[PDB]
Amino acid sequence: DVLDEQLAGLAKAHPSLTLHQDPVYVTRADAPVAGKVALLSGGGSGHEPMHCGYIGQGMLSGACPGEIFTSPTPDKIFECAMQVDGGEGVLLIIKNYTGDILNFETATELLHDSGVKVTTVVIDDDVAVKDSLYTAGRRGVANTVLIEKLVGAAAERGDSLDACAELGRKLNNQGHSIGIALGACLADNEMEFGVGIHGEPGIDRRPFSSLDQTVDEMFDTLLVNGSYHRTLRFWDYQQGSWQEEQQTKQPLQSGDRVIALVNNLGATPLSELYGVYNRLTTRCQQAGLTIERNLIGAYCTSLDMTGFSITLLKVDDETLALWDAPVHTPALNWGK
Amino acid sequence: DVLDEQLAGLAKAHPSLTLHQDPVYVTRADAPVAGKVALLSGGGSGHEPMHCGYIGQGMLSGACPGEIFTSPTPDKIFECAMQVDGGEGVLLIIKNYTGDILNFETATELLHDSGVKVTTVVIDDDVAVKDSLYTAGRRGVANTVLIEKLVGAAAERGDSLDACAELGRKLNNQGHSIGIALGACLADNEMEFGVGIHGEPGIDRRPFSSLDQTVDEMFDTLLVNGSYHRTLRFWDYQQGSWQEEQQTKQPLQSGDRVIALVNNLGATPLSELYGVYNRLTTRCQQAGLTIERNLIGAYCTSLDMTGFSITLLKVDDETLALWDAPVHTPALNWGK
């Protein structure tokens, strides 16, 4: 099995990780880490390094890869959570797709019944389409990475489960993303505008004229599709039930300070991502948005898709301190 | 100009870098760093992050990007060297291509004529073809990155120009690389075996049967094409002349300890690189090679070429300590 070989490769390359079998999941080699909230995510294979490359101090305690573009099954999530539980609870970060929501929610209930204190954060940052074939609402994409790092820092600092969960839900309401594909993982010189990370259709297919023009269209969409009201359920561990919570996003606005992630969906040359970043800084400056930090690279992919996404996450001094906090993972590494 | 936009993007993304104009080159924002050997490289654009993503503490003092797949002109190299000169010499790392050799060698003479103490290291690690399209000898490829890190660590701790040069030349004789392409940056299910990073032809075109079989062919070739005797010129700054030096490489052999770099030439998914790494570990174990450290990712590219390269560099305890030493650049970051 090729997925087997790929995960074996991951494990051999990174002694800081432990690959488990029966069921398969990956954790930090030092898990369970006593006295800290444990953070977990997962989803289909094919988005590497999301989420396995984000396992480590200051970020995820473990992750649960599934088959290609397919949520892991509940047994993997349950077993991974039980392995990383440090006695302060486990927070599950779930990207908004039919499969992931079902499987992670099932695992949440199984955990609660086994006495594990658990709650959830749903990610729905893709501003492009509401109600795509495999999502109720908006899709969860690259802002998931930014939230993992920020919530990861908070957990590492010693924040409680509730505090980590509230922070995750708040950041989710402040991050906005959009992706484009020039070719899947249709017509030449044509792009899928607002594509999903499993290849889901976007807003439309339209001509590619230039990188700068494409970035302008993506940026404009982030500015105008920002307003959003919807229900997101979260697990209330005190009552042992799902709580429907209305959640509101405000549009990005002049005066906002942001973290920008220019993300390779798979086969875009880094040179081009820097070109994208250049146009993006220009547009943010014109719109009154201050980019405070950035990430540019392959962080949330879709196999070998030719395309890229832009994520802008509103932040404040406190959030920037969490960003600057140390992180030690395969894909993201920085010290104090 | 697209290149202009991409370099501006690089500069805006990384305050640790300074982009210069008239002529264009990039340096560490803190250069010149007094009292340390300054390390520089450069080459065509289209291999990002090599070399601009390696500018930073523990690695390059600056780099000189040229036009796509084209060496920078001598003025860019000269001005970059003068900007980073810290009074202890400048070491130029040159990949072995007709253009790069001519331009860096011309810049070397100009520097010497201007009173700057300089010397060079030529990289010729690609074992695939001798006398390719644009190279006298063997081509300089991804081992250039490992050498920049190792010599970069040596310069950073205060080693002399001579010691840094000697180290680079020694490492060059110990590193071996080969790349393959499935599609350029021809026939279906066929690969260019031993492809060059500018898209130069390889050993041959052959069928692609599986990832594991491809890795086996690549690995076998590294084992059998290892032995190599050739002349590499270096600048003798005491005599003010080029010195023709015979240099010898031994084949990789049972008992060797190595650093392995599995490198995306452009559009290979990370999942596939881990699969490559998994097979590579098996083959190394069978051959008696101990992999002590690895790097897996997009480190020395060829636009959006679909393909990857494998580099194995023989090392010892001293070299491993240089590898583990702190490095803080756009592409590579680790501390103690």
From Swiss-Prot, chains A, B:
It comes from the Bacteria. Its EC number is 2.7.1.121. One of its GO terms (biological process) is monosaccharide catabolic process. GO terms for molecular function: glycerone kinase activity; identical protein binding; phosphoenolpyruvate-glycerone phosphotransferase activity; protein homodimerization activity. Dihydroxyacetone binds at G44, S45, G46, H47, K95, D100. It holds the Pfam family Dak1. Unlike the carbohydrate-specific transporters of the PTS, the complex DhaKML has no transport activity. This is PEP-dependent dihydroxyacetone kinase, dihydroxyacetone-binding subunit DhaK. It comes from Escherichia coli (strain K12).
